[PDB]
Amino acid sequence: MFHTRQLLVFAHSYALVTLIAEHLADGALPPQLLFHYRNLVAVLRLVT
């Protein structure tokens, strides 16, 4: 979906974003797509 529609998917839920950041980080995704979810987590920590 990032390559065809140009959007990061599963963003609508906290659980999918957090699980993608945590468990899809040992490979699996290209680094940029991973970094987007890690950045969403970092935004939440920043707000804290």
Added chain:
Amino acid sequence: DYEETLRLFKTTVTSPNYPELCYLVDVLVHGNVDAFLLIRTFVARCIVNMFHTRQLLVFAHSYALVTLIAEHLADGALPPQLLFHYRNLVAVLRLVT
């Protein structure tokens, strides 16, 4: 100007996916030069693989490994970009002192 190396240092150190193998190799080398030299090629392969598939430096958590990589891993088999990040780390250590 060492702020790009320090941005990569920040991302590496604060990243939650930092590989567990680095702590093991850190405790297994514990500052020995000859231990690092015996593990040398393994270390370079880990650095390249984690820079390209993750996006973070490797062994940057520990002073000993950073210094050993800066000094002994400067022949080659490590691309000059990674090597210069490690050089800039030791140069920041030298600047502060």
